[PDB]
Design a protein around this ligand. Structure first.
Ligand SMILES: Cc1cccc(-n2nc(C(C)(C)C)cc2NC(=O)Nc2ccc(Nc3ncnc4ccc(N)cc34)cc2)c1
Length: 261
């Protein structure tokens, strides 16, 4: 029905990448010459007009640090098609074989890029709701992009949101501070040892994560700004973008590598 439409025959589906309840995600081939990621709808497990609100949104929100919609087969079976990210989810990349070698300069660069994707989302006055590593894709050359896999994540969610349902670009910012610990511990779970009910209790009373081992203090301070009790006092993604981009000159000019960061 719109120019995003393509025929179900231009697609050679190849390797499975796992199932959610609504369908499957496949690596594959568009016009025999393009690496794509194809998302599935199992018919009857849900309606088109809901399964395709994703593609709908991915048509509005287009940006170099956001995941890229390519095309739709919006007639059953229904397919959504986007660019293929050759290193998968950022969470698997940080805990896997690749995380042995990632140092603070690549990690902050990743950070700078997700921030930049998020700067666009702020600008577009849209709200993410589930910023965290499991939702960032990594591509060739440590290229990161904000995605949503439709994965409660209270460990990543700002109080005002987990409690009262006040999700905003500012709760997205809290989540960013949590992402900064993921990047700086190679994707370890935030708040190790606490269980959800104690995170709510503990963060309510002002408890905040300490400096990760080897993380510079000024990055911890940035995490802390991200986690202010007061939504409006947390910084913009635009600020976050710039401060990160500029890190190794303005903020940590004497940075030296160590064993892990
Ligand atoms: C559920 C829903 C509903 C409404 C909107 C969304 N949004 N929202 C966004 C924002 C706001 C960030 C633009 C993005 C989405 N949707 C989305 O990210 N969908 C999506 C993206 C990539 C994939 N899968 C893979 N793709 C590209 N390489 C891979 C490489 C490895 C791998 N394992 C999976 C993949 C599946 C679904 C999501």
């Amino acid at each position: 029905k719109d120019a995003w439409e393509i025929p179900r025959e231009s697609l050679r589906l190849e390797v499975k990448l796992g199932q959610g309840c609504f369908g499957e995600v496949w690596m594959g081939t568009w016009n025999g010459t393009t690496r794509v990621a194809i998302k599935t709808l199992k018919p009857g497990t849900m309606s088109p007009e809901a399964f395709l609100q994703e593609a709908q949104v991915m048509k509005k929100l287009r940006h170099e640090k956001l995941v890229q919609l390519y095309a739709v087969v919006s007639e059953e079976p229904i397919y959504i098609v986007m660019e293929y990210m050759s290193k998968g989810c950022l969470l698997d990349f940080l805990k896997g074989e690749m995380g042995k070698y990632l140092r603070l300069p690549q990690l902050v660069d990743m950070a700078a890029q997700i921030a930049s994707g998020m700067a666009y989302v702020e600008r577009m006055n849209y709200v993410h709701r589930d910023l965290r590593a499991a939702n960032i894709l990594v591509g060739e050359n440590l290229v990161c992009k904000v995605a949503d896999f439709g994965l409660f994540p209270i460990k990543w969610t700002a109080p005002e949101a987990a409690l009262y349902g006040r999700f905003t670009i500012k709760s997205d910012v809290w989540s960013f501070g949590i992402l900064l610990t993921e990047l700086t511990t190679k994707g370890r779970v935030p708040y190790p040892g606490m269980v959800n009910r104690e995170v709510l209790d503990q963060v309510e009373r002002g408890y905040r994560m300490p400096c990760p081992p080897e993380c510079p203090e000024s990055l911890h301070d940035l995490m802390c700004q991200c986690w202010r009790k007061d939504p409006e006092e947390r910084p913009t993604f635009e600020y976050l973008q710039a401060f990160l981009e500029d890190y190794f000159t303005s903020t940590e000019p004497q940075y030296q590598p160590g064993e892990n960061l």
